[PDB]
Design a protein around this nucleic acid. Structure first.
Length: 400
RNA sequence: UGUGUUAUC
């Protein structure tokens, strides 16, 4: 801090005025100092005269180098955001030029700012607060090459993409959907901790749910086509994604969401059916298998149940079957518990059994009897395990 | 008995 602003204690004077700082030419020293920026931040929330605003506009968001220096600063980024807000609230003759400047500064350094822990906050608040037509121009400044992957998997920058998805119409960011849907990009992004969150947010925004009822029918058509293109790519890589440590959450999201029912069915047919025994023994995919049981339409659920009960040839020596393997497997046991709970819910009326012009209660009763008979026969071994005690208790509670 | 994301003074 400039000496003029310090007391005899070597500490920022109290009773300092905003205008003194603005007049001094020393704002940049205050804005990058914890105490100095705290003062500016409080000062700019109060009444400001036209000239005070003018000075703040010039000094904080008026020149490219200083704008970038504050935007990328741990303290300064807050002041930048405050001054952008004041700029947008001040409809004098300078309004247009100030916002165009801000758009040019950010666009010209878009990737660098998105990747920065602090400047990415400036980007997000600009996207949601600036006039929409100018915010759309920021989106246009996003890179279209390998840097876009870098942004999508970055701990900071992924939040910029999620903000774009939230507050900008789809036509402006449709290019991101197609970028992410490219096979090699999908693989990289979905297999990343942050990238997987970005893809789920995109899918959510492309879903025709109660949150999108305000779209025009033309916008719904745009959305439906983008969703269909993304789902095609996800479905093409379903097996790889379902078994992955992060992308399994995406596959689960799709399978679990009734508003994605047509895609849920594709996924189940494409990579789960005929692979249930194998996938139920996988750490990540076993959760996908549970979601499929829980949400499959009746005709597919029947195929799934039939696969577990009768889809596999028992061991040639021991006679162990798929149910035997799954009941005692470290991951498979949860899938069998899920099957049992579904059947108990159906027969007790906690789950609707009518669908497809028929009451399928008879099917659930059949599957339940098979599970009950197995659990009865194998009660001694099952009672050795928490999972087995749980199934025994589940069946006991049903009788009650 | 079994997995992640939700990030600044």
């Amino acid at each position: 801090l400039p000496t003029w602003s310090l007391d005899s204690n070597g500490e920022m004077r109290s009773r300092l005025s905003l205008s003194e700082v603005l007049d001094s030419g020393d704002l940049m020293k205050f804005a990058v100092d914890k105490t100095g920026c705290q003062f500016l931040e409080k000062a700019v929330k109060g009444s400001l005269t036209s000239y005070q605003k003018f000075q703040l506009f010039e000094q904080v968001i008026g020149r490219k180098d200083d704008f970038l220096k504050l935007s990328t600063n741990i303290f300064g980024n807050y002041l930048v955001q405050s001054v952008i807000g004041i700029s947008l609230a001040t409809n004098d003759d300078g309004y247009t030029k100030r916002q165009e400047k801000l758009k040019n500064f950010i666009s010209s350094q878009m990737t660098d700012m998105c990747l920065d822990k602090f400047a990415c906050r400036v980007i997000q608040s600009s996207l949601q607060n600036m006039d929409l037509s100018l915010a759309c121009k920021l989106v246009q400044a996003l890179p279209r090459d390998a840097r876009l992957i870098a942004i999508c998997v970055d701990q900071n920058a992924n939040h910029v993409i999620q903000k774009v998805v939230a507050v900008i119409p789809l036509k402006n960011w449709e290019f991101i959907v197609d970028f992410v849907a490219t096979p090699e990009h999908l693989r990289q992004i979905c297999s990343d901790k942050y990238g997987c969150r970005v893809v789920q947010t995109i899918i959510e925004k492309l879903t025709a749910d109660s949150m999108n009822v305000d779209l025009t029918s033309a916008a719904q058509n745009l959305r439906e086509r983008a969703l269909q293109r993304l789902m095609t790519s996800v479905t093409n890589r379903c097996q790889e994604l379902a078994t992955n440590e992060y992308a399994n959450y995406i596959i689960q999201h799709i399978v679990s969401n009734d508003d994605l029912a047509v895609y849920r069915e594709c996924i189940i047919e494409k990579c789960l059916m005929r692979n249930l025994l194998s996938l139920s023994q996988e750490k990540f995919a076993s959760h996908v298998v549970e979601k499929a049981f829980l949400h499959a339409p009746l005709e597919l659920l029947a195929e799934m149940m039939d696969e577990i009960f009768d889809g596999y040839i028992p061991h040639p020596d021991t006679g162990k079957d798929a149910l035997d393997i799954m009941m005692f497997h470290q991951f498979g046991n949860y899938v069998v518990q899920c099957m049992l709970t579904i059947c108990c819910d159906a027969v007790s009326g906690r789950r609707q059994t009518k669908e497809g012009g028929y009451d399928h209660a008879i099917s659930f009763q059949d599957w339940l009897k098979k599970l009950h008979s197995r659990v009865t026969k194998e009660r001694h071994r099952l009672s050795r395990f928490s999972s087995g005690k749980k199934m025994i208790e589940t069946l006991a509670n049903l009788r009650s």
